[PDB]
């Protein structure tokens, strides 16, 4: 068994998009997670796979909803930053 | 050297017994021709193995750091030497003593 | 030095440059070239098997190879025989075109006058 990262395996486009891939052996631009909201969304996802299986449907719905709200707040703050740096 | 030290995981399983540990050596000053018992400060180079010089193994022809304070050696600036190089020149594994000649 | 294809070259192996280092077995060897490159030269060499002989190929660059002149001596002999043959035919006399294996020496007498032999002891003491 050898890792798909070690093997030069091209990325394949599926229902999960590949997106704009980065050239190999070049500068993969570092995006930094230092915002309280971005830490919130990453933390919410991490706690989701850590807790895992829940019998209660409403509890599962609330877990998904808190992840969704974290993403919504992150997107809002990033759009606000975009507007701030584009106007002022 | 020390007694209750915690070794890195790199060396944690190397066991060095009390019966084999040595703390003083018979060090000979050639020009001031005299042999005295002096404490060992550190192990600088075992010419047989880097692992041995890391572990402090004392073999023939091995450079060690020795406290030469009792000799009262005056340096060029006028100070008394507190540490010099000494070569182990015997087989401490066959002789229950450590014998060194001071490189001065 | 310019080396063509088909000539015979001796290998010296100097220690000045480590590039293109040949083995001690190929050191001090004589062979024929088959490939010529910008710097290296392909030489056909004869290697000794534990019971036979085989032909190997080595890559040695310019600074180790030099020309030989065994064939120069052979051509000198051919010219020398041709010239003696023509001269002998012109003069109507026979000559030896062969070469001799250095036969033993003939009888002679050596005089003692002014050359009195000196007696020697087994060891020289003085």
């Amino acid at each position: 068994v050898y890792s798909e990262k070690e093997l030069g395996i091209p990325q394949l486009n599926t229902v999960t998009p590949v997106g704009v891939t980065k050239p190999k052996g070049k500068k993969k631009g570092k995006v930094f997670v230092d915002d309280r909201e971005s830490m919130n969304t990453i933390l919410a996802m991490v706690e989701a796979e850590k807790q895992g299986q829940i019998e209660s449907k409403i509890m599962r719905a609330r877990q998904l909803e808190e992840i969704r709200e974290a993403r919504r707040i992150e997107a809002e703050k990033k759009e606000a930053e975009r507007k701030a740096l584009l106007e002022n | 050297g020390p007694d209750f030290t915690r070794r890195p995981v790199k060396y944690e399983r190397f066991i060095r017994p009390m019966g084999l540990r040595y703390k003083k050596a018979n060090v000979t000053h050639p020009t001031l021709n005299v042999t005295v018992q002096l404490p060992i400060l550190s192990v600088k180079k075992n010419p047989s193995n880097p692992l041995y010089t890391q572990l402090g193994v004392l073999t023939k022809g091995t450079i060690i750091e020795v406290n030469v304070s009792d000799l009262g050696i005056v340096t060029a600036s006028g100070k008394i030497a507190w540490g010099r190089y000494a070569q182990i020149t015997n087989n401490p594994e066959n002789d229950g003593c450590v014998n060194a000649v001071l490189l001065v | 030095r310019t080396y063509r294809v088909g000539d015979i070259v001796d290998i010296k192996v100097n220690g000045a440059v480590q590039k293109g280092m040949p083995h001690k077995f190929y050191h001090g060897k004589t062979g024929v070239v088959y490939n010529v490159t910008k710097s290296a030269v392909g030489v056909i060499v004869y290697k000794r098997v534990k019971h036979r002989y085989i032909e190997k190929r080595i890559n040695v660059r310019i600074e180790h190879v030099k020309p030989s002149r065994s064939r120069e001596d052979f051509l000198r002999r051919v010219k020398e025989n041709a010239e003696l043959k023509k001269k002998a035919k012109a003069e109507g006399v026979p000559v030896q075109l062969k070469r001799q294996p250095a036969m033993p020496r003939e009888a002679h007498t050596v005089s003692i006058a002014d050359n009195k032999p000196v007696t020697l002891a087994p060891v020289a003491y003085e």
């Binding site: - | 050639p30 180079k45 010419p47 047989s48 100070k79 030497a81 190089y85 070569q87 | -």
Partner: protein, 66 residues
């Protein structure tokens, strides 16, 4: 596969060559200390203690300072 075939073919020669290289290393280390001893006997200009840096670099720095 090809790399491991070469490893099995050359396994023992590597071992003997490494033994020889270690012997050469021991000879070189003993030589450098002998040079240090000879230079100290001839002359030398030090401080109270020895240099805190590694011994190999310490010895070289002395044998180059002269």
């Amino acid at each position: 596969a090809r790399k491991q075939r070469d490893l099995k073919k050359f396994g023992k020669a590597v071992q003997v060559q490494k033994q020889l290289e270690r012997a050469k290393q021991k000879r070189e280390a003993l030589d450098k200390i002998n040079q240090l001893k000879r230079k100290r006997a001839e002359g030398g200009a030090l401080g109270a203690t020895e240099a805190d840096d590694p011994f190999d670099v310490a010895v070289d720095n002395e044998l180059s300072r002269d």
